[PDB]
Design a protein around this ligand. Structure first.
Ligand SMILES: Cc1cn([C@H]2C[C@H](N=[N+]=[N-])[C@@H](CO)O2)c(=O)[nH]c1=O
Ligand SMILES: Cc1cn([C@H]2C[C@H](N=[N+]=[N-])[C@@H](CO)O2)c(=O)[nH]c1=O
Lengths: 813, 813
């Protein structure tokens, strides 16, 4: 149907149809008489999968022959979403499959909805890993994603009586056609035991063994015939495990629990033993795999060349145990001396920091490591001692610096600071947006920056334009392609060419038309799938992201209530109609986040059923927000809410997705918002609120929320409404926790940004009254969104950290 | 190479090779450069599997159109072994695959050894189920095997220091290419809860739900294009299970433990709750599936025709809960009155008894059923009351009969006798050999036989000649086929034609040649796989079966020691050389059986290293005895030991396997040995020892083992040797338990059969000295083994129990 979706050649369509029928018969063991839509989905998935394998085998063969430097991206999270449409896009198969399925009497879009999300992440950090894999393959890098194959990913969120309920994400129930089990490459991982000292150094003995079984998933580059690998480890008990008889067999579960479930915490550290086991499990199996591949190379025993052939990227501190594990292997097993091993380790490892929030920093109790990983603790102590000797020599007499920089934190419980370990053992440390990277050097890692300034870098985050434009917004990709061609898909800077169309009446009409169609499609989706009725002529005001105090969904709530109260005060006055959509999951143990969800639904309950309001204001909580839902709501959005307190959101990536898809942004000067505004021009952004410096000034003075309550009558009214039970008639004190927090212990200064936020929202509404000028501003945003492609981000990692050159060159088909 | 293995047509070989290469590439994602023999096995398995699916789909389609009476074979055990070679044989593909793999530079026999046994059974009972499935498909019956897909089958047995060690049978590790998951047909199973009474009868409420997910495995008939289904259920937790968060997800294991492991008890009842859950799990899911299929038929609401369209065969009492579960569904859910429901139940169900040993009988504590299955207990009480009212009316005043026949046993703990439940609720009850069936009517079920004589039948066991001749002994199948053609493979009575070749010098030479080749092949196997050296010119004396006191491996041990002592007494005297092979697993908690294994190895330790013995006597314990090992050792055997105490082995089936493969039998008049001897003529069997009547006479008098010890000097010497530490120098009292048992508490009268056994063994040795006459007797055995085909057995079930006609007619290809 549309150009960007590839050719539907007679030969290809015929070949796809017959292979579809073959899979339905031989693979699914069905005929057309008994097949369900799920069967049809699987026959399609298997057909598309077949096109990958040849490229997959020759890509890996190519790397064996050429022996390039290999990039190992270590992450506990890969938030992949669905794979079917993504694979078709990158293989140029979408129109052909659409045609082949149409001719078989099937709707491909219906079949696509059947695929489960691979929900192996929490949010930003996990989704960045997924975007990174796509970009690395697209840029021809010899890259491998390594992680854990969780049996249960992020929970499915149900809303019951306005409250979040969690249910198990049993994503493997019907099978996963994309993965290939590789039981032949199973590796042992050791836990517990004790350390023994001999003439030949230390020995780790009396350990429990858990097996790590790899599952490989293909990662196709964009139309370049490159197919990289994501390898995910699964925990298996050895066959002599605990070997009365029946119980010993049943106890195998204990070992296999390691890969059972993803910890559903976003930007929060929970010091549980199972989590530590997961972290070591991925690290130990991965490093063995890395070393095996290194020894079995066309190049080489000699570990001097190890950093020339291997880069390990640590996605946050979660795989920080890679550092002492690499030391363990090199010193204890390969018998390298400490200094040489350390040189190799530092030159191999690099660390990416994702947040400055203290509650997210990993600080493991020493007693946990002592029991679980006794040899790693000894190595960490030794790293610490040698590192602090370096600090002492550079800053003689500075005893407080020594305590501040120590990997070992003293106190009630002794802890290991994993961030400090990462900096010490990596040749590069990066933040994820310019402002965040500067905050690292100025505040939390100031001491480390003074010692080793060369180590500190910025790599501003990005998103893949394949998933986040072509796949989810084909209509927009197409109108862009009509004007400037298709090259921008793997070279997003070319979107600048769109600036010369900002006064083009045809283009203005097309941009606005694509948005309306997206909005109609999403409005229909809501009725069909959730039985909720919305006005597609209203401004789609959306905030979608994990529920957090720092992300300030509560500030959004305050604005919504302000609009409601203003309408109630002057009912017959004209207001720009809005659909306010808020979505995201709360971590199960995060009480305040669960209260905020309840608040949003409670506001909806009052606002959506007030006859005086009509269809002028609607508040909807978007249930079970996840990658596949993001692909639907983001193209439909007019307004993107990025309203975190300045200095708290390291980068954000949702912001970039909205910019690419034709939404205007209301936000603070936080994270990547700063660079986005810089790229588009501040005139083309709705920036409000305190800057980082203003927050610091308020902290020194002391934040007093009562002041704002006293001086802003509209804010006072909202607090009285919350307190008195206006939004909870049956349970008048339901929201006392929220009011108390806002009035007395608000770390994120919600009240302090209220006035400017409400005023800025009025400026948004005014612009929306003028469709042509709204759309012209939109064009100015889309046109300057190129910097935020993960292809740019990965090219920067490649050149400035990994020491490898990106390549757009095709491999032969 | 050989005739019976089918055609190797140019078209077929070419087509097999290309499909092999396709699977290696697309299915396994490998090329010839990286593929292991395991990969080659899997590519072959997938290629052969493809040939099944078309036949599988049309067989099931055929049953839907024709709507025949369906047979449901309910078993907790299906001892399937390997599937690859069996599938090739039944599809006439073996030579073609052999040729196709040869041309690809691969040895097919090497690839066949890579397949894991499906070890989902303990021994005789589970293997009978497997033979039955093969025969039912071969006879064109619309039959379904229903069971549990255990994650761990029967343990792998390792021998360490002469002791049995158990390790987990992780048979699914590398995947199972034969099964197809059917998550779309998942069904709920209920546990616990309570019973509520309403105006509309009883209601079972507040239950825990476990999901039952079916996996279908194809069962091909012999060259008739029929492919039936074995459906095995797997336990899955529902997604809201226990739904802090992490623990709730981890606790899903509790539910899924139901299908985790096979209870490794052979002929022994262990009253564990998990076992009861397994029994109800298979029954509840199966019956829902049965009823669903019944309602969705071309015929029919009206349950009057239910027994016309459905037969349920209960393999032992393990699925006995089918009876009250069917009542529950019909009464509580379908709202049929009790009397009608009961009529339907009785006419639907039939029960096969497998043993008379009291320790094997299932007697469940009432308190277990009360908690787990409260509604089923109420139904059982009601069945009991109505049944005992019938007994009271037929035998007025006979109060002891009432207590003897009650389904409820009184005592310390109240128990339900599941055998009594089965008889009451089935229209047919059968034993598994003529002598066993007579013992049922005369002893343990005498009262029930007096009440309902019409219910009691015999169905003598059988084995499939496909697996147990063609597959494991192609050399013998071929020389037979040269003389009499190939029709005997699905009509084993035709082997009688071989009687006219008993004086044929060519045939005599060929029979003896096939045995020698088998013996050489097995002797080589032992060296390669276990590094043990044996003389292939010796008589292969083999006893393979589960380790039990009743099977009297100990009597065999006594004979072995007698031979050793006789050699030591007169070293320079000639004795017929023997390799004595004993193999089988002991249940992990069965101490005496584990001691017997230790004894066998201990004897081997002394005998195998005595220079005076030389290669005249060898004692070998065959490790990890299982179906695949049976297929190797049985064709190599000269002497088959079937030496259970008369009246204890209900049938046996190993006996029949040895008879079919050219071994002579030494045995008691027990189980099917009686019918085997009757078929071949007693002159052509080595029968010894007490008959059932002699055992009873000894029981009345009182068995005194001391008497035999006093009067048999050779027996006395063996006991002194055991006691004094002759076979355990480091641990002189190691075998005190065994001696004490033999002397004081021997339920199985080992000493009482010693003299006759030893004398009979001398007659065996004498015959073996005359090769021509040994082989002529062998021919007389093979030639009369036809009755013991499971095709005969199943034809008898079909006609006399299920009310269906067998068919040899081909379905179209
Ligand atoms: C599970 C979870 C809890 N919390 C709770 C833990 C802290 N309890 N205290 N004190 C509180 C403040 O960080 O928030 C959070 O912030 N994020 C989370 O993800
Ligand atoms: C596990 C197992 C134990 N036993 C033990 C249980 C009994 N213990 N007592 N008394 C003993 C005699 O039946 O054998 C058995 O016979 N067969 C088995 O399979």
């Amino acid at each position: 149907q549309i150009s960007v979706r590839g050719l539907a050649g007679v030969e290809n369509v015929t070949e796809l149809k017959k292979n579809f029928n073959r899979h339905l018969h031989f693979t699914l063991v069905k005929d057309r008489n008994v097949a369900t839509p799920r069967d049809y989905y699987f026959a399609l998935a298997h057909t598309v999968r077949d096109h990958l394998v040849g490229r997959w085998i020759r890509t890996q063969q190519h790397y064996y022959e050429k022996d390039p430097k290999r990039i190992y991206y270590l992450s506990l999270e890969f938030y992949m979403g669905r794979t079917l449409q993504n694979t078709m896009v990158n293989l140029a198969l979408e129109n052909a499959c659409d045609e082949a399925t149409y001719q078989l009497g099937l709707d491909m879009e219906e079949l696509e909805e059947i695929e489960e999300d691979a929900g192996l992440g929490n949010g930003g950090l996990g989704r960045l890993a997924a975007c990174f894999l796509d970009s690395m393959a697209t840029l021809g890098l010899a890259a491998y994603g390594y992680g854990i194959r969780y049996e249960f990913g992020i929970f499915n969120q149900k809303i019951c009586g306005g409250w979040q309920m969690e249910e198990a994400d049993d994503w493997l129930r019907y099978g996963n056609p994309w993965e290939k089990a590789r039981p032949e490459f199973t590796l042992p991982v050791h836990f517990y035991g004790r350390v023994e000292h001999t003439s030949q150094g230390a020995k780790w003995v009396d350990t429990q063994v858990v097996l790590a079984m790899p599952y490989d998933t293909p990662v196709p580059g964009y139309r370049n015939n490159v197919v990289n690998t994501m390898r995910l480890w699964s925990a298996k008990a050895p066959n002599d495990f605990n070997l009365g008889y029946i119980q010993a067999v049943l106890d195998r579960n204990l070992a296999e629990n390691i890969s059972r479930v993803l910890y559903p915490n976003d930007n929060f550290f929970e010091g549980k033993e199972l989590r530590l086991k997961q972290e070591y499990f991925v690290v130990a199996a991965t490093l063995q795999d890395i070393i095996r591949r290194f020894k079995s190379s066309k190049f080489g025993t000699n570990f001097d060349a190890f950093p020339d052939k291997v880069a390990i990227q640590l996605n946050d501190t979660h795989p920080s145990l890679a550092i002492p594990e690499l030391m363990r292997v090199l010193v204890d097993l390969e018998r390298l001396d400490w200094d040489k091993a350390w040189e190799v380790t530092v030159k191999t490892c690099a660390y990416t920091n994702h947040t400055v929030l203290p509650e997210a920093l990993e600080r493991w109790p020493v007693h946990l490591l002592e029991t679980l990983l006794p040899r790693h603790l000894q190595i960490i102590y030794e790293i610490n001692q040698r590192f602090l000797n370096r600090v002492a020599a550079a800053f003689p007499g500075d005893v407080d610096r020594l305590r501040r920089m120590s990997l070992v934190e003293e106190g009630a419980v002794k802890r290991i600071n994993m961030a400090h370990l990462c900096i010490a053992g990596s040749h590069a440390v990066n933040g994820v947006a310019r402002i965040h990277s500067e905050i690292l050097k100025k505040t939390i890692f100031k001491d480390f920056y003074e010692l080793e300034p060369h180590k500190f870098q910025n790599k501003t985050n990005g998103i893949t334009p394949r998933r986040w434009l072509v796949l989810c917004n084909p209509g927009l990709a197409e109108i862009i392609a009509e004007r400037i061609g298709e090259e921008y898909i793997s070279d997003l800077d070319q979107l600048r060419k769109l600036l010369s169309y900002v006064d083009d009446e045809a283009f203005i009409r097309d941009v606005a038309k694509v948005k309306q169609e997206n909005k109609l499609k999403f409005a229909a989706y809501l009725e069909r799938e959730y039985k909720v009725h919305i006005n597609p002529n209203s401004l789609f005001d959306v905030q979608v992201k994990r529920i957090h105090e720092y992300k300030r969904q509560l500030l959004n709530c305050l604005h919504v209530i302000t609009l409601y109260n203003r309408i109630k005060k002057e009912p017959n006055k004209f207001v720009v109609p809005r659909t306010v959509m808020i979505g995201g999951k709360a971590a199960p143990g995060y009480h305040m986040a669960k209260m905020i969800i309840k608040l949003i639904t409670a506001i909806g309950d009052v606002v959506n059923h007030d006859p005086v309001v009509g269809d002028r204001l609607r508040v909807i909580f978007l249930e079970n927000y996840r990658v596949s839902l993001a692909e639907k709501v983001i193209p439909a959005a007019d307004l993107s809410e990025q309203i975190s307190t300045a200095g708290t959101e390291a980068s954000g990536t949702g912001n970039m997705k909205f910019m690419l898809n034709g939404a205007l942004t209301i936000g603070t000067m936080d994270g990547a918002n700063v660079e986005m505004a810089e790229e588009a021009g501040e005139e083309n952004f709705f920036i409000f609120g305190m800057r980082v410096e203003d927050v610091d000034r308020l902290d020194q003075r002391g934040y007093n929320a009562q002041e704002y309550y006293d001086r802003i009558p509209e804010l006072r009214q909202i607090i009285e409404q919350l307190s008195s039970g206006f939004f909870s008639p049956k349970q008048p004190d339901l929201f006392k926790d929220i009011v108390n927090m806002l009035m007395h212990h608000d770390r994120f200064k919600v009240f302090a940004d209220y006035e400017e936020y409400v005023k800025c929202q009025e400026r948004v509404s005014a612009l929306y009254k003028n469709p042509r000028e709204w759309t012209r501003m939109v064009i100015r945003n889309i046109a300057t969104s190129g910097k935020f492609s993960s292809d740019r981000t990965i090219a920067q990692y490649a050149r400035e950290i990994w020491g490898v050159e990106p390549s757009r060159q095709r491999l032969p088909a």
